[PDB]
Amino acid sequence: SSMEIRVRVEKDPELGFSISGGVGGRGNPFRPDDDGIFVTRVQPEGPASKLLQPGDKIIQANGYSFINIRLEEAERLLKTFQNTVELIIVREVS
């Protein structure tokens, strides 16, 4: 059971969260057999606080699909975007 969430994070100066995972990558601490990109830590007083949560799977960012993406490409895109970034994430619920 899960929900899909569309959120806008205003870089100031970064998005304020970390990512793990990726195709051909080293995995993630949330869904071991999923090669997706996962929000891993969120900076507590940063632009993503109260918007994203650890474990959120990023499936789209500024219109780029993050399904089947390499970690390095996800990171470099997210760092290259300017100002407000629109994310679509998937959040699991117990």
Partner: peptide
């Protein structure tokens, strides 16, 4: 192990 990258 998995690793993380800040953005």
């Amino acid at each position: 192990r998995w690793y993380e990258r800040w953005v």
